[PDB]
């Protein structure tokens, strides 16, 4: 079964929130992985790298297993998490849950003119973690994704059809590469382009419109 | 300010520093000084023919250990001598001598911590007949 124990969770169990964007507009914190599953039922994962790793406790070499799992839609939502664990099949299923917990949108724009759907990125963006830099660049139609295979597979599940990459730094520790392409996506909502210049009034939260509901006993 | 000049009439310092310390790229210095003639045993060629002095047996000392069979030779265009390598008659049964042979190089660089020791060449044919045509036995060595 599912008992919500967080007061966002009661609001979505009763069905007062129908899309995920109300979590994103008022930027609400999320701490229960079942909220995403009912909200985004089409979510879908792959595992990137599984590596045994070692700790010399009591000079007894106990084996852990680190896993890198990316979950993601094929519309504009991604996720990524990492978990070490004692057994192999626990580290995969524990690795999925953190990745379900960290979902972000992505602004998807055009290259040039305005015919039909958006395919590429809106602007150029960049994130750096560790020592790696990764920079993403808009492309025309027919381009496809030009990246390394571990980064091309990420951007399929966010559903960008054409994009140009360019990466500096030591790109051969893939736990750090993917943690830079992640930052370089999630900044796309955050560059104030000129069409976002206009004014709008502030909406009000669901966490007090439905305040009598989703309250503890 | 980056430690290099930026202004507009500055093209002469910029192009005369660049060829100044372009002499630390390791194989641009080999090409302009032209050390391929003055030091290399081949002079700048793919293959080269020599005439075999004698059989040699060489061994590989640390972690590896086995019986590597090589051959002395003396080049016709040059007179200098080198030690080639013959591939995997590991049966120890193809000594041959006062013969005409064709060398080549390895795609060379290696690891001799197992001490697969300091030769640089190989053998692709002997007395007008390929090596693999004898090992796969498609010809046999021409004589009367």
């Amino acid at each position: 079964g599912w008992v919500p124990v967080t007061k966002l969770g009661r609001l979505v169990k009763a069905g007062k929130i129908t899309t995920i964007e109300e979590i994103f507009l008022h930027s609400l914190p999320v701490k229960e992985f079942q909220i995403i599953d009912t909200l985004l039922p089409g979510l879908q994962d792959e595992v990137m790298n599984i590596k045994p790793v070692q700790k010399q406790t009591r000079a007894g070499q106990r084996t852990r297993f680190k896993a890198v799992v990316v979950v993601g839609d094929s519309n504009g939502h991604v996720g990524l998490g990492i978990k070490t664990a004692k057994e192999v099949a626990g580290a995969i299923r524990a690795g999925i849950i953190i990745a379900k917990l960290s979902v972000i949108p992505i602004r998807r724009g055009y290259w040039g003119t305005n015919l039909g759907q958006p395919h590429s990125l809106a602007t150029k963006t960049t994130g750096k973690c560790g020592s790696v830099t990764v920079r993403l660049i808009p492309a025309p139609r027919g381009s496809g994704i030009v990246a390394s295979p571990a980064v091309k597979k990420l951007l399929q599940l966010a559903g960008v059809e054409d994009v140009y990459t360019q990466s500096n730094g030591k790109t051969r520790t893939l736990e750090n590469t993917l943690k830079a392409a992640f930052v370089a996506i999630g900044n796309t909502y955050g560059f104030l382009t000129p069409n976002l210049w206009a004014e709008q009034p502030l909406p009000v939260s669901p966490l007090d419109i439905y305040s009598d509901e989703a309250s503890a006993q | 300010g980056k430690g290099k000049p930026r202004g507009l009439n500055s093209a002469r310092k910029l192009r005369v520093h660049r060829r100044n310390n372009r002499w630390a790229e390791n194989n641009y210095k080999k090409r302009l000084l032209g050390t391929a003639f003055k030091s290399s045993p081949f002079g700048g060629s793919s293959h080269a023919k020599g005439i075999v002095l004698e059989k040699l047996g060489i061994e590989s000392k640390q972690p590896n250990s086995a019986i590597r069979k090589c051959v002395r030779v003396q080049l016709i265009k040059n007179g200098k001598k080198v030690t080639a390598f013959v591939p995997n008659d590991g049966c120890l049964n193809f000594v041959d001598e006062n013969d005409e042979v064709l060398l080549a190089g390895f795609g060379r660089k290696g690891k001799a911590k197992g001490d697969i020791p300091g030769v640089r060449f190989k053998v692709v044919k002997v007395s007008g007949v390929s090596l693999l045509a004898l090992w796969k036995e498609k010809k046999e060595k021409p004589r009367s």
Partner: protein
């Protein structure tokens, strides 16, 4: 050892078919049937 000079053409295993027909054969043997080892995948396997 060598070739036989008499090959004039004026006046253990069965073969494989060579050319465009071989591309037809490979299309079947991995895309019209299946081979698994309990969902996990070791196609073209060792016989065990």
């Amino acid at each position: 050892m060598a070739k036989v000079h008499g090959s004039l053409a004026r006046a253990e295993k069965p073969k494989k078919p060579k050319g465009r027909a071989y591309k037809r054969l490979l299309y079947t043997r991995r895309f019209v049937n299946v081979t698994l080892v309990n969902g996990k995948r070791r196609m073209n396997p060792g016989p065990s």
